[PDB]
Amino acid sequence: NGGHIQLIIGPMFSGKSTELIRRVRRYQIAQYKCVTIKYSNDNAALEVTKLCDVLEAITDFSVIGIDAGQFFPDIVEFCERMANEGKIVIVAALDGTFQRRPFNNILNLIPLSEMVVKLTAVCMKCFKEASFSKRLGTETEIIGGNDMYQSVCRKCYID
Amino acid sequence: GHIQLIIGPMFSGKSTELIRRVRRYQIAQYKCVTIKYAALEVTKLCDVLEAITDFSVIGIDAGQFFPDIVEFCERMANEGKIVIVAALDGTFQRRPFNNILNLIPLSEMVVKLTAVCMKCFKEASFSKRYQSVCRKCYID
Amino acid sequence: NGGHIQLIIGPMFSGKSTELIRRVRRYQIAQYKCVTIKYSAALEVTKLCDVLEAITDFSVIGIDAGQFFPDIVEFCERMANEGKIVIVAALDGTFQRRPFNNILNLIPLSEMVVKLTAVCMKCFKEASFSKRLGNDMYQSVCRKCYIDS
Amino acid sequence: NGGHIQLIIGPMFSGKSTELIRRVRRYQIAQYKCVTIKYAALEVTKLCDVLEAITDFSVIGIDAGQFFPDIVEFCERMANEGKIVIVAALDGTFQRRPFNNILNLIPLSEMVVKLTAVCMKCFKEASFSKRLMYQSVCRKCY
Ligand SMILES: Cc1cn([C@H]2C[C@H](O)[C@@H](COP(=O)(O)OP(=O)(O)OP(=O)(O)O)O2)c(=O)[nH]c1=O
Numbered sequence: 001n002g003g004h005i006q007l008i009i010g011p012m013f014s015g016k017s018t019e020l021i022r023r024v025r026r027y028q029i030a031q032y033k034c035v036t037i038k039y040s041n042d043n044a045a046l047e048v049t050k051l052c053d054v055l056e057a058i059t060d061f062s063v064i065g066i067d068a069g070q071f072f073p074d075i076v077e078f079c080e081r082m083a084n085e086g087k088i089v090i091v092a093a094l095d096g097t098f099q100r101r102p103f104n105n106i107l108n109l110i111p112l113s114e115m116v117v118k119l120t121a122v123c124m125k126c127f128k129e130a131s132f133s134k135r136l137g138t139e140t141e142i143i144g145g146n147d148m149y150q151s152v153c154r155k156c157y158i159d
Numbered sequence: 160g161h162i163q164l165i166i167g168p169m170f171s172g173k174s175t176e177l178i179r180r181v182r183r184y185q186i187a188q189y190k191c192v193t194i195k196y197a198a199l200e201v202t203k204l205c206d207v208l209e210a211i212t213d214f215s216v217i218g219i220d221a222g223q224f225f226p227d228i229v230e231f232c233e234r235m236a237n238e239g240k241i242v243i244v245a246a247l248d249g250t251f252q253r254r255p256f257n258n259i260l261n262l263i264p265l266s267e268m269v270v271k272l273t274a275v276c277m278k279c280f281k282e283a284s285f286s287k288r289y290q291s292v293c294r295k296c297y298i299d
Numbered sequence: 300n301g302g303h304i305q306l307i308i309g310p311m312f313s314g315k316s317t318e319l320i321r322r323v324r325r326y327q328i329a330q331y332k333c334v335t336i337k338y339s340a341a342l343e344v345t346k347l348c349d350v351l352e353a354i355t356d357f358s359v360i361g362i363d364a365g366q367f368f369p370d371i372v373e374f375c376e377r378m379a380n381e382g383k384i385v386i387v388a389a390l391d392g393t394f395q396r397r398p399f400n401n402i403l404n405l406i407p408l409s410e411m412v413v414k415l416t417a418v419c420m421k422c423f424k425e426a427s428f429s430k431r432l433g434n435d436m437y438q439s440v441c442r443k444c445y446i447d448s
Numbered sequence: 449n450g451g452h453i454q455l456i457i458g459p460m461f462s463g464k465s466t467e468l469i470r471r472v473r474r475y476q477i478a479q480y481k482c483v484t485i486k487y488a489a490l491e492v493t494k495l496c497d498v499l500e501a502i503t504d505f506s507v508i509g510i511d512a513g514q515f516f517p518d519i520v521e522f523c524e525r526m527a528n529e530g531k532i533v534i535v536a537a538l539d540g541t542f543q544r545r546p547f548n549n550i551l552n553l554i555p556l557s558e559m560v561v562k563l564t565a566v567c568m569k570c571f572k573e574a575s576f577s578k579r580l581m582y583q584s585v586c587r588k589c590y
């Protein structure tokens with residue numbers, strides 16, 4: 001009785017969500033019962049805030065794709081339960097916040113995942129490989145596109 | 160410039176990976192353009208030399224259909240342009256193609272993606288006339 | 300600053316150390332100043348903050364079994380901020396599949412992260428976890444074989 | 449008829465051989481009967497002669513496979529006998545010209561990966577090989 005967990009991290013603008021739908025479409029086109037979840041009020045996928053709300057619903061599905069997984073506090077127990085019930089869990093999440101500090105409870109999922117990959121963005125200042133996200137406003141994050149965030153490399157993140 | 164090459168059987172996601180790699184540059188204020196058999200529909204790649212002269216990022220989908228794929232991609236990468244190609248590596252008989260192999264010794268990055276077998280639900284790496292299958296299901 | 304951090308994780312018997320010396324030999328064969336560190340040819344230390352002064356003249360730093368070094372985090376960042384390339388091969392999870400928090404705190408700071416797989420020693424499929432019973436007391440297993448034992 | 453083929457290409461000094469023995473060590477440490485071939489390990493020039501010998505092995509690793517003329521027939525025949533075949537070969541010559549049958553093996557391979565070296569001129573990403581000894585270079589330096 002075994003599933004697995006695929007983990008996709010990376011900075012903003014690196015394409016995590018698109019890679020998520022590629023892996024999901026791989027199974028869905030092979031007649032898998034696929035469902036996708038994303039975090040509501042972000043800016044065919046379900047929009048929820050707590051994963052404990054959909055624990056009962058997706059019992060009949062074999063493929064679970066989750067976008068913006070760092071926002072779900074119960075992401076780890078959820079993925080472990082589904083992976084132990086024979087379901088394939090694919091997660092696209094941020095590894096670090098704007099302060100390059102760990103995001104919520106998303107790292108505790110790596111000792112439980114079968115595959116972990118980090119994608120790269122393009123730096124919007126020195127047009128090199130970006131691996132960090134940097135907010136442009138004055139708050140201390142807040143969700144947004146590129147108007148307030150930019151994907152940068154190591155040298156451009158510190159001034 | 161350089162050449163990124165993405166191969167794999169049908170239903171493996173080559174086109175989606177193509178647009179991901181292209182969108183990475185496009186979001187960084189690159190002048191990006193895409194070609195299929197911003198968007199272009201052509202039959203011969205030697206015909207589009209004039210159009211994309213002002214572009215730095217070139218994406219090509221279903222590159223095996225272009226007979227001059229090998230000369231075109233190099234004759235674009237040697238002018239500082241980034242070329243990202245999503246193409247099939249093998250025909251229905253898992254036989255070599257006319258002139259898509261000759262592009263790999265010139266590419267800087269080459270990756271082969273996998274599909275899901277539509278018969279035995281395992282890893283798929285071949286195409287059969289359509290269904291994507293593995294080795295056991297291809298020669299059952 | 301000018302450097303970066305490459306992170307190689309995976310269970311035991313997945314080949315992390317071999318991949319480490321491959322990535323280093325790529326730079327070393329290009330006349331880079333490389334140095335390698337291991338836990339107590341490569342230096343053998345217990346605290347990484349002792350060799351901060353020593354390896355100042357090196358551009359490539361490879362570390363094996365990074366989970367054992369408590370100061371792994373503040374080390375790699377400092378080295379990466381001095382223009383140095385830092386390559387780490389460490390375990391992601393213990394035998395209880397619990398995090399090596401010192402290692403996990405390095406991922407939001409790393410430029411590259413990859414997880415390698417081993418081969419299951421019970422049902423011979425892909426393995427991503429380590430279990431206790433040297434090799435005669437550890438085994439690389441998959442999810443199904445980790446719980447059913 | 450239930451095996452597969454893993455393919456490793458790249459220029460010189462990219463680490464293809466080290467990756468080869470890493471992938472083989474993965475299986476060998478899991479009590480697989482592994483054997484390695486170069487131009488327990490055998491050293492031969494034609495692969496079609498050792499078909500009978502390695503019948504009891506499930507994992508076959510080949511290095512510098514471009515030098516074996518019968519690499520394709522061998523890898524297909526061996527993969528169709530439940531054996532895992534891992535090949536590490538050069539993708540391009542010193543003239544950036546295609547290889548004899550290494551490419552004709554890609555439509556038959558289950559996994560294909562290309563590794564990169566470090567440029568020995570501008571210390572950037574290298575993907576090509578050049579002659580003087582030998583050096584791994586990028587596009588601009590070639
Ligand atoms: C950097 C950062 C972002 N956010 C927010 C902003 C983002 O919209 C959201 C998650 O962003 P993502 O959806 O991961 O970024 P993206 O979808 O635009 O990039 P891609 O699809 O290519 O992977 O989280 C925070 O809440 N805190 C932070 O520190």
Ligand SMILES: [Zn+2]
Nearest residue numbers: 123126153156
């Ligand atoms: Zn930058």
Ligand SMILES: [Zn+2]
Nearest residue numbers: 276279293296
């Ligand atoms: Zn099949």
Ligand SMILES: [Zn+2]
Nearest residue numbers: 419422441444
């Ligand atoms: Zn097992």
Ligand SMILES: [Zn+2]
Nearest residue numbers: 567570586589
């Ligand atoms: Zn160079």
